[PDB]
PDB file of C-alpha atoms in Angstrom:
ATOM      1  CA  UNK A   1     134.636  85.960  78.249  1.00 48.12           C
ATOM      2  CA  UNK A   2     131.665  86.072  80.599  1.00 48.68           C
ATOM      3  CA  UNK A   3     128.811  83.555  80.288  1.00 50.54           C
ATOM      4  CA  UNK A   4     125.183  84.556  81.198  1.00 51.02           C
ATOM      5  CA  UNK A   5     124.971  86.057  84.576  1.00 50.21           C
ATOM      6  CA  UNK A   6     121.791  88.364  85.380  1.00 46.77           C
ATOM      7  CA  UNK A   7     120.445  90.326  88.200  1.00 46.34           C
ATOM      8  CA  UNK A   8     117.807  88.635  90.089  1.00 46.71           C
ATOM      9  CA  UNK A   9     116.892  91.416  92.910  1.00 47.18           C
ATOM     10  CA  UNK A  10     117.665  94.762  94.419  1.00 46.46           C
ATOM     11  CA  UNK A  11     116.292  95.473  97.867  1.00 44.83           C
ATOM     12  CA  UNK A  12     115.990  98.215 100.613  1.00 44.51           C
ATOM     13  CA  UNK A  13     114.936  96.728 104.041  1.00 43.65           C
ATOM     14  CA  UNK A  14     114.225 100.017 105.467  1.00 45.04           C
ATOM     15  CA  UNK A  15     114.665 102.703 102.502  1.00 46.49           C
ATOM     16  CA  UNK A  16     118.015 103.685 104.065  1.00 50.89           C
ATOM     17  CA  UNK A  17     120.119 100.971 102.232  1.00 48.93           C
ATOM     18  CA  UNK A  18     120.001  98.418  99.735  1.00 47.95           C
ATOM     19  CA  UNK A  19     121.869  95.643  98.031  1.00 48.16           C
ATOM     20  CA  UNK A  20     121.413  94.085  94.441  1.00 50.53           C
ATOM     21  CA  UNK A  21     121.755  90.374  93.633  1.00 53.65           C
ATOM     22  CA  UNK A  22     122.735  88.193  90.611  1.00 51.51           C
ATOM     23  CA  UNK A  23     123.588  85.050  89.442  1.00 50.04           C
ATOM     24  CA  UNK A  24     126.947  83.078  88.530  1.00 49.90           C
ATOM     25  CA  UNK A  25     128.630  83.323  85.266  1.00 51.50           C
ATOM     26  CA  UNK A  26     128.450  79.303  84.273  1.00 53.74           C
ATOM     27  CA  UNK A  27     131.699  79.741  88.198  1.00 55.71           C
ATOM     28  CA  UNK A  28     134.189  81.941  86.256  1.00 54.14           C
ATOM     29  CA  UNK A  29     135.763  85.024  88.253  1.00 56.04           C
ATOM     30  CA  UNK A  30     135.801  88.156  86.327  1.00 57.39           C
ATOM     31  CA  UNK A  31     132.421  89.594  87.688  1.00 52.70           C
ATOM     32  CA  UNK A  32     131.592  93.168  88.598  1.00 52.77           C
ATOM     33  CA  UNK A  33     129.011  95.709  89.283  1.00 50.37           C
ATOM     34  CA  UNK A  34     129.061  99.404  88.251  1.00 50.25           C
ATOM     35  CA  UNK A  35     126.474 102.165  89.080  1.00 50.52           C
ATOM     36  CA  UNK A  36     125.858 105.622  88.257  1.00 49.35           C
ATOM     37  CA  UNK A  37     124.152 108.530  89.955  1.00 48.96           C
ATOM     38  CA  UNK A  38     122.002 109.609  86.758  1.00 50.32           C
ATOM     39  CA  UNK A  39     118.979 108.939  84.665  1.00 48.61           C
ATOM     40  CA  UNK A  40     127.645 109.680  83.022  1.00 48.85           C
ATOM     41  CA  UNK A  41     130.503 108.368  85.615  1.00 48.79           C
ATOM     42  CA  UNK A  42     130.236 104.710  86.583  1.00 49.81           C
ATOM     43  CA  UNK A  43     131.993 103.769  89.634  1.00 50.61           C
ATOM     44  CA  UNK A  44     132.718 100.176  90.768  1.00 52.04           C
ATOM     45  CA  UNK A  45     130.390  98.678  93.574  1.00 51.68           C
ATOM     46  CA  UNK A  46     131.637  99.875  96.843  1.00 50.98           C
ATOM     47  CA  UNK A  47     130.944  96.692  98.922  1.00 52.47           C
ATOM     48  CA  UNK A  48     131.028  93.184  97.185  1.00 54.80           C
ATOM     49  CA  UNK A  49     130.876  91.270 100.510  1.00 57.37           C
ATOM     50  CA  UNK A  50     128.333  92.840 102.929  1.00 60.80           C
ATOM     51  CA  UNK A  51     125.305  91.490 101.223  1.00 60.52           C
ATOM     52  CA  UNK A  52     126.675  87.866 100.716  1.00 62.58           C
ATOM     53  CA  UNK A  53     127.465  86.016  97.429  1.00 60.96           C
ATOM     54  CA  UNK A  54     126.903  87.762  93.903  1.00 59.95           C
ATOM     55  CA  UNK A  55     125.985  90.854  95.838  1.00 60.62           C
ATOM     56  CA  UNK A  56     126.761  94.660  96.082  1.00 61.15           C
ATOM     57  CA  UNK A  57     125.696  96.270  99.116  1.00 60.60           C
ATOM     58  CA  UNK A  58     125.350 100.209  99.211  1.00 63.80           C
ATOM     59  CA  UNK A  59     125.328 101.801 102.590  1.00 63.35           C
ATOM     60  CA  UNK A  60     123.051 104.697 103.851  1.00 60.48           C
ATOM     61  CA  UNK A  61     125.074 107.309 102.274  1.00 62.79           C
ATOM     62  CA  UNK A  62     123.473 106.235  99.029  1.00 62.84           C
ATOM     63  CA  UNK A  63     119.960 107.335 100.158  1.00 64.01           C
ATOM     64  CA  UNK A  64     121.033 110.843 101.439  1.00 64.32           C
ATOM     65  CA  UNK A  65     118.888 112.235  98.880  1.00 64.74           C
ATOM     66  CA  UNK A  66     116.439 110.911  96.484  1.00 65.58           C
ATOM     67  CA  UNK A  67     118.773 108.615  94.551  1.00 68.36           C
ATOM     68  CA  UNK A  68     117.859 107.597  90.679  1.00 67.25           C
ATOM     69  CA  UNK A  69     120.564 104.846  89.989  1.00 65.12           C
ATOM     70  CA  UNK A  70     121.359 102.655  87.062  1.00 61.88           C
ATOM     71  CA  UNK A  71     123.797  99.754  87.325  1.00 57.16           C
ATOM     72  CA  UNK A  72     125.231  97.021  85.178  1.00 57.86           C
ATOM     73  CA  UNK A  73     126.945  93.776  85.611  1.00 57.01           C
ATOM     74  CA  UNK A  74     130.160  93.066  83.930  1.00 61.61           C
ATOM     75  CA  UNK A  75     131.731  90.120  82.952  1.00 61.97           C
ATOM     76  CA  UNK A  76     135.666  90.885  82.214  1.00 60.25           C
ATOM     77  CA  UNK A  77     134.675  94.356  81.131  1.00 57.86           C
ATOM     78  CA  UNK A  78     131.635  93.774  78.907  1.00 55.90           C
ATOM     79  CA  UNK A  79     127.997  94.508  80.242  1.00 54.08           C
ATOM     80  CA  UNK A  80     125.954  91.499  80.912  1.00 56.98           C
ATOM     81  CA  UNK A  81     122.829  92.908  82.585  1.00 56.21           C
ATOM     82  CA  UNK A  82     121.594  96.632  83.532  1.00 55.22           C
ATOM     83  CA  UNK A  83     118.687  97.861  85.620  1.00 55.27           C
ATOM     84  CA  UNK A  84     117.916 101.497  86.786  1.00 55.70           C
ATOM     85  CA  UNK A  85     116.026 102.434  89.849  1.00 53.67           C
ATOM     86  CA  UNK A  86     115.278 104.604  92.643  1.00 54.35           C
ATOM     87  CA  UNK A  87     115.472 103.365  96.429  1.00 54.29           C
ATOM     88  CA  UNK A  88     111.524 104.032  96.776  1.00 55.09           C
ATOM     89  CA  UNK A  89     110.679 101.354  94.066  1.00 56.15           C
ATOM     90  CA  UNK A  90     112.595  98.694  95.948  1.00 55.86           C
ATOM     91  CA  UNK A  91     111.873  98.926  99.526  1.00 55.31           C
ATOM     92  CA  UNK A  92     110.835  95.645 100.678  1.00 56.13           C
ATOM     93  CA  UNK A  93     110.427  95.380 104.585  1.00 52.68           C
ATOM     94  CA  UNK A  94     111.256  92.407 106.780  1.00 49.58           C
ATOM     95  CA  UNK A  95     108.674  90.112 108.462  1.00 46.54           C
ATOM     96  CA  UNK A  96     107.477  90.387 111.694  1.00 45.92           C
ATOM     97  CA  UNK A  97     108.886  87.878 114.245  1.00 47.13           C
ATOM     98  CA  UNK A  98     107.924  86.080 117.569  1.00 50.98           C
ATOM     99  CA  UNK A  99     104.078  85.480 116.392  1.00 49.51           C
ATOM    100  CA  UNK A 100     101.899  84.447 119.164  1.00 54.91           C
ATOM    101  CA  UNK A 101      98.281  83.894 119.758  1.00 61.27           C
ATOM    102  CA  UNK A 102      95.654  83.891 122.806  1.00 62.46           C
ATOM    103  CA  UNK A 103      92.058  82.662 122.841  1.00 64.93           C
ATOM    104  CA  UNK A 104      89.722  85.676 123.378  1.00 64.82           C
ATOM    105  CA  UNK A 105      86.266  84.375 123.512  1.00 62.66           C
ATOM    106  CA  UNK A 106      84.121  81.207 122.270  1.00 63.69           C
ATOM    107  CA  UNK A 107      80.626  81.735 120.935  1.00 63.57           C
ATOM    108  CA  UNK A 108      77.650  80.874 122.695  1.00 62.42           C
ATOM    109  CA  UNK A 109      77.133  77.729 120.808  1.00 62.28           C
ATOM    110  CA  UNK A 110      80.684  76.706 121.311  1.00 60.94           C
ATOM    111  CA  UNK A 111      81.085  76.374 117.171  1.00 57.85           C
ATOM    112  CA  UNK A 112      83.182  79.740 116.810  1.00 57.15           C
ATOM    113  CA  UNK A 113      86.041  81.456 118.475  1.00 56.76           C
ATOM    114  CA  UNK A 114      87.928  84.701 118.563  1.00 55.89           C
ATOM    115  CA  UNK A 115      91.449  85.089 118.891  1.00 55.64           C
ATOM    116  CA  UNK A 116      94.060  87.432 118.929  1.00 49.21           C
ATOM    117  CA  UNK A 117      97.251  86.965 117.070  1.00 45.74           C
ATOM    118  CA  UNK A 118     100.457  89.122 117.780  1.00 41.01           C
ATOM    119  CA  UNK A 119     104.132  89.606 116.863  1.00 42.77           C
ATOM    120  CA  UNK A 120     107.188  91.779 116.929  1.00 40.13           C
ATOM    121  CA  UNK A 121     108.079  94.213 114.339  1.00 39.46           C
ATOM    122  CA  UNK A 122     111.640  93.371 112.600  1.00 43.47           C
ATOM    123  CA  UNK A 123     114.282  94.652 114.748  1.00 45.89           C
ATOM    124  CA  UNK A 124     115.254  97.025 112.144  1.00 46.31           C
ATOM    125  CA  UNK A 125     112.499  99.472 112.737  1.00 45.96           C
ATOM    126  CA  UNK A 126     109.335 104.495 107.615  1.00 46.97           C
ATOM    127  CA  UNK A 127     106.433 103.165 109.596  1.00 45.00           C
ATOM    128  CA  UNK A 128     105.247  99.661 108.763  1.00 43.18           C
ATOM    129  CA  UNK A 129     101.748  98.242 108.593  1.00 41.46           C
ATOM    130  CA  UNK A 130     101.152  94.758 108.395  1.00 43.79           C
ATOM    131  CA  UNK A 131      99.000  92.505 106.679  1.00 44.68           C
ATOM    132  CA  UNK A 132      97.988  89.206 108.373  1.00 46.80           C
ATOM    133  CA  UNK A 133      96.902  86.177 106.482  1.00 44.97           C
ATOM    134  CA  UNK A 134      95.325  82.902 107.436  1.00 41.21           C
ATOM    135  CA  UNK A 135      93.259  80.041 105.906  1.00 40.01           C
ATOM    136  CA  UNK A 136      92.116  76.396 106.743  1.00 36.67           C
ATOM    137  CA  UNK A 137      95.247  74.184 106.810  1.00 39.77           C
ATOM    138  CA  UNK A 138      93.643  71.556 104.290  1.00 38.38           C
ATOM    139  CA  UNK A 139      92.260  74.600 102.362  1.00 40.59           C
ATOM    140  CA  UNK A 140      94.213  76.526  99.392  1.00 45.08           C
ATOM    141  CA  UNK A 141      93.169  80.049  99.220  1.00 45.31           C
ATOM    142  CA  UNK A 142      94.474  82.452 101.916  1.00 49.57           C
ATOM    143  CA  UNK A 143      92.353  84.870 103.818  1.00 49.33           C
ATOM    144  CA  UNK A 144      93.679  88.438 104.036  1.00 50.05           C
ATOM    145  CA  UNK A 145      92.920  91.486 106.304  1.00 50.38           C
ATOM    146  CA  UNK A 146      93.458  94.907 105.778  1.00 49.65           C
ATOM    147  CA  UNK A 147      96.837  96.395 106.768  1.00 48.43           C
ATOM    148  CA  UNK A 148      97.080  97.329 110.468  1.00 46.60           C
ATOM    149  CA  UNK A 149      99.655  99.405 112.137  1.00 47.95           C
ATOM    150  CA  UNK A 150      99.870  97.487 115.710  1.00 46.84           C
ATOM    151  CA  UNK A 151     101.771  94.476 116.427  1.00 47.37           C
ATOM    152  CA  UNK A 152      98.745  92.512 117.106  1.00 46.31           C
ATOM    153  CA  UNK A 153      95.362  92.168 115.641  1.00 47.80           C
ATOM    154  CA  UNK A 154      92.198  90.421 116.357  1.00 49.83           C
ATOM    155  CA  UNK A 155      90.693  87.381 114.226  1.00 53.26           C
ATOM    156  CA  UNK A 156      86.962  86.898 114.589  1.00 52.36           C
ATOM    157  CA  UNK A 157      85.139  83.787 114.224  1.00 53.66           C
ATOM    158  CA  UNK A 158      87.476  80.968 113.322  1.00 51.18           C
ATOM    159  CA  UNK A 159      85.448  77.554 113.542  1.00 51.13           C
ATOM    160  CA  UNK A 160      86.654  75.582 116.736  1.00 53.02           C
ATOM    161  CA  UNK A 161      86.665  72.529 114.361  1.00 55.75           C
ATOM    162  CA  UNK A 162      89.528  73.457 112.125  1.00 55.71           C
ATOM    163  CA  UNK A 163      93.310  73.733 112.394  1.00 54.56           C
ATOM    164  CA  UNK A 164      94.458  77.125 110.946  1.00 52.53           C
ATOM    165  CA  UNK A 165      97.745  78.786 109.416  1.00 55.15           C
ATOM    166  CA  UNK A 166      98.681  82.114 110.295  1.00 54.27           C
ATOM    167  CA  UNK A 167     101.404  84.356 108.278  1.00 54.68           C
ATOM    168  CA  UNK A 168     102.323  88.172 108.335  1.00 51.57           C
ATOM    169  CA  UNK A 169     104.049  90.239 106.035  1.00 52.09           C
ATOM    170  CA  UNK A 170     105.493  93.741 106.598  1.00 53.18           C
ATOM    171  CA  UNK A 171     104.766  96.679 104.338  1.00 53.83           C
ATOM    172  CA  UNK A 172     105.844 100.507 104.152  1.00 56.86           C
ATOM    173  CA  UNK A 173     102.672 102.627 105.292  1.00 55.08           C
ATOM    174  CA  UNK A 174     101.620 104.072 102.088  1.00 54.71           C
ATOM    175  CA  UNK A 175     102.715 103.309  98.506  1.00 53.32           C
ATOM    176  CA  UNK A 176     104.702 100.043  99.758  1.00 54.24           C
ATOM    177  CA  UNK A 177     105.869  96.944  98.351  1.00 55.58           C
ATOM    178  CA  UNK A 178     105.417  94.006 100.789  1.00 58.93           C
ATOM    179  CA  UNK A 179     108.090  91.937 101.764  1.00 60.53           C
ATOM    180  CA  UNK A 180     108.522  88.330 102.503  1.00 63.58           C
ATOM    181  CA  UNK A 181     106.150  86.607 105.091  1.00 63.79           C
ATOM    182  CA  UNK A 182     107.011  85.643 108.537  1.00 63.30           C
ATOM    183  CA  UNK A 183     107.418  82.235 109.973  1.00 62.47           C
ATOM    184  CA  UNK A 184     103.904  80.317 109.688  1.00 61.52           C
ATOM    185  CA  UNK A 185     102.157  80.230 112.911  1.00 61.13           C
ATOM    186  CA  UNK A 186      99.690  77.107 113.563  1.00 64.53           C
ATOM    187  CA  UNK A 187      96.499  77.730 115.345  1.00 64.41           C
ATOM    188  CA  UNK A 188      94.599  74.625 116.524  1.00 67.86           C
ATOM    189  CA  UNK A 189      91.408  75.360 118.483  1.00 66.71           C
TER     190      UNK A 189
END
């Protein structure tokens, strides 16, 4: 038999490699992934271990030329899920790490302050631009800044009276999907 397993996500961290993920057949044991380089010949997943559980990992030989794939989940032998995609549609960079911040200036009234948030580009870096986000801790909407190329960015006019939250996500320059957010950095003036 099989059960009801389904694809969750396929992700490319740097547009060179990617892996696809799915759920458990509920565990049963006869699951497989097959892929094809067309819209033809179906070949089994080349690596069921590198990307972890219920995953298939495709090394950089799969992004030699513009790719155009299709994959299907298999339980015993019967399809249970399918998906087609190119590596471009799934690019999703890793977030920055080591978020820091220094005070830059205080307004004449001491009411406001300017800071500079800094971070390190994910260690696997396709040129990335970052989108910094912040908001009052006690608030619920996140203010967003334009994507920037530098691994730092000044944030102007924060109110001294408040405690802030900062988070930066990575994105491929141009049409690029965003990736996960970094570890939240707390800013108390």
